A = this chain, B = another copy of it.
Amino acid sequence: QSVTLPANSEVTYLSGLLPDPVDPKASKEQIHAEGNTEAQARVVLRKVETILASQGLTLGDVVQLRIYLVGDPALGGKLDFDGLQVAFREFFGTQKQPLKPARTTVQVAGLVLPGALIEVETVAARAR
């Protein structure tokens, strides 16, 4: 629905995050990601957690999540939203972390990393 930031909030913007290449040491021309949308989303949400934690922030501090999916051929070229929702539910609305941010999921035509099916963009804010 909606999230409201107090005027005393400290706001942190992340770059869009992609899954890790299977070999981060591969050449610029063979660097690529593997896995289906659910697997890749799980990797990317963990990266968000890790980056946020290194700032003293938690997944409960997320105020806005923008998720860009690439269509999966097995799904008629459509975005794999069900795969995404599985991973997303492991990280948000659970008991370790109950909160859910404002979010948006759209199907894009492509991402910069070959084989990547998901990129996530994050805004977090710690009230004060």
Is B14 a contact of A102 with CB atoms below 8 Å? yes
In this complex, how many residues of chain A approach chain B with their Cβ under 8 Å: the count is 44
Is B1 a contact of A51 with CB atoms below 8 Å? yes
A108 to chain B, nearest CB (A): 5
Is B7 a contact of A13 with CB atoms below 8 Å? no
Among the interface residues A5, A13, A77, A105, which one has the most CB atoms of the partner chain B within 10 A? A13
Once A16-B105, A119-B106 are accepted as A-B contacts, the answer to whether A7 and B10 lie under 8 Å apart by CB is: yes
Main secondary structure of the interface of A (DSSP, over half): strand
CA distance A70 to B5 in the complex (A): 31
Cβ-based interface call for A9 (8 A): yes
Once A107-B110, A108-B109, A111-B107 are accepted as A-B contacts, the answer to whether A10 and B14 lie under 8 Å apart by CB is: no
Is A79 a contact of B112 with CB atoms below 8 Å? yes
A40 to chain B, nearest CB (A): 15
Is A15 a contact of B108 with CB atoms below 8 Å? no
CA distance A78 to B109 in the complex (A): 9
List chain B residues, Cβ under 8 A from A68.
104, 106
List 5 contacting pairs A-B, 8 Å CB cutoff, sorted by A: A3-B13, A4-B11, A5-B12, A13-B102, A107-B110
